[PDB]
């Protein structure tokens, strides 16, 4: 092919093809090994639907509730976009729990794969933070009272309790400053950290392969 | 289907197999059998189920926040129920917080405590399997009890 | 009753999963029969 | 709030998945002798 030769002599794309076509799937792998990939699919649906709603949502105490209602009743197919974002958030957590059961019951965490387990625990903590921050964006009765309770937990610590509370709230009490910081975590910070730790998770797996038979 | 043999005679493969690796060198070819034909089937099914639930069970709007009025009954998301039950039933602030933090911390030491045994099958790990089953029962017992009055925590209204 | 509804749905999910796997082996059996004819 | 359909799905897929993982492991154990 004329097109193929043009790229081959400049970037050596043939090396990539050879790497992909040199992998095999051993016969002890069954359908339960699909659970890790299904969790990734749910996360990609969150990115597509979450980005769409950033074109209509306003993060202020005066406009947050009204803007969410505008999406559900006025925007084209807005009812569908919001509903998918909420159902797909619960399915992501459910599929991750079943992934952990498969890993533990096949002994896939043992040597030399300890660091793959460790990076997985971090991804679990980041996913939980996604739910809490997004739970309060509507600024309704259920969302408002959850933020106040969660942000007050660190107070029990003897020395670093009180100063840590003000960093989360941005003040001594819940208000506009709290909503501004939670929106930044949900749409900028957490997405960035998740991408970094997913890359570490996948690089280790590809370098070592899948664990052996039972 | 189509399969490939290990070819044990290769010195390189034997070196990897002794270290717990090399299991992506035999079996069925990955391309196009799995990546190009089967993975799309799984992706289509996942999306279709999410879309089906969204149409049949849309989301509710709610009510604007009121700082002076707390709802009579308020709950977190379903996957916070076990820790939520711990706070209600433990009348001590500091103790309750420490137990919550020990869930992710305890889960982080699993690989460094079971390395003494080198088997993978759960039927060759009697002690590890027993601990796992007990933890699963306890977590479900606390989760169901978070939707009931505190006086029924220890019985769930059964006995 | 909320408890009754939740338990009813939980039982149906178990049934759907078993039926899905069984129908998978029926297709494999049909394929084998045609493989010789 | 209480979600009838969401809670029913969670409590249905956990026990069935655990049973499948134990059945496959047992078959490999018997043939390993």
């Amino acid at each position: 092919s004329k097109v193929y030769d043009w790229f081959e002599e400049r970037l050596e794309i043939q090396a990539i093809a050879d790497d992909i076509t040199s992998k095999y799937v051993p016969p002890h792998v069954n359908i339960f090994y699909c659970l890790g990939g299904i969790t990734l699919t749910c996360f990609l649906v969150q990115v597509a639907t979450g980005f769409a709603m950033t074109f209509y949502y306003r993060p202020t105490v005066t406009d947050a509730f009204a803007s969410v209602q505008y999406i559900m009743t006025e925007v084209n197919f807005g009812w569908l976009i919001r509903s998918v974002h909420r159902w797909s958030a619960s399915m992501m957590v459910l599929m991750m729990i079943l992934h952990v059961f498969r890993v533990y019951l096949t002994g896939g965490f043992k040597k030399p794969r300890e660091l793959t387990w460790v990076t997985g625990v971090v991804l679990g903590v980041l996913t939980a933070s996604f739910g809490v921050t997004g739970y309060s964006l509507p600024w309704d009765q259920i969302g408002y009272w959850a933020v106040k309770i969660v942000t007050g937990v660190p107070d029990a610590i003897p020395v670093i309790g009180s100063p840590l509370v003000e960093l989360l709230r941005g003040s001594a009490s819940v208000g506009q400053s709290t909503l501004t910081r939670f929106y930044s975590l949900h749409t900028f910070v957490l997405p960035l950290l998740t991408a970094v730790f997913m890359l570490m998770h996948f690089l280790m797996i590809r370098k070592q392969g899948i664990s052996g038979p039972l | 289907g189509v399969t490939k043999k290990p070819d044990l005679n290769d010195p390189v493969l034997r070196a990897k197999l002794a270290k717990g690796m090399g299991h992506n060198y035999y079996g069925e070819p990955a391309w196009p059998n799995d990546l190009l034909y089967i993975f799309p089937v799984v992706i289509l099914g996942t999306i279709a189920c999410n879309v089906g639930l969204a149409v049949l069970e849309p989301s509710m709007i709610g009510e604007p926040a009121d700082p002076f009025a707390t709802p009579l009954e308020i709950l977190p998301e379903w996957y916070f129920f076990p820790v939520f039950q711990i706070l209600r039933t433990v009348p001590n602030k500091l103790l309750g917080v420490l137990l919550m933090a020990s869930v992710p911390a305890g889960l982080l030491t699993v690989p460094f405590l079971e390395n003494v045994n080198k088997f993978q099958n759960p039927f060759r790990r009697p002690v590890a399997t027993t601990v796992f089953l007990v933890g699963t029962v306890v977590a479900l017992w606390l989760g169901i009890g978070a939707t009931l009055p505190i006086d029924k925590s220890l019985t769930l209204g059964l006995f | 009753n909320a408890a009754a509804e939740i338990f009813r749905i939980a039982a149906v999910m178990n049934g759907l999963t078993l039926v899905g796997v069984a129908i998978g082996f029926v297709l494999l059996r049909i394929e084998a029969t045609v493989e010789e004819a | 709030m209480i979600e009838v359909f969401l809670f029913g799905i969670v409590l249905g897929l956990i026990p069935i998945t655990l049973a499948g993982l134990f059945v496959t492991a047992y078959l490999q154990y018997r043939r390993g002798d």
């Binding site: 016969p27 002890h28 | 002794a18 | 494999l28 | 059945v23 078959l27 043939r31 390993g32």
Partner: peptide, 26 residues
């Protein structure tokens, strides 16, 4: 031949190593 034997083969492939083989355990 036996129907039960046919089911066992499909549930788990018979062309796999086993944890007790000396090549892997050694």
């Amino acid at each position: 031949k036996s129907f039960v034997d046919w089911l066992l083969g499909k549930i788990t492939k018979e062309d796999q190593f086993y944890e007790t083989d000396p090549i892997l355990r050694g």
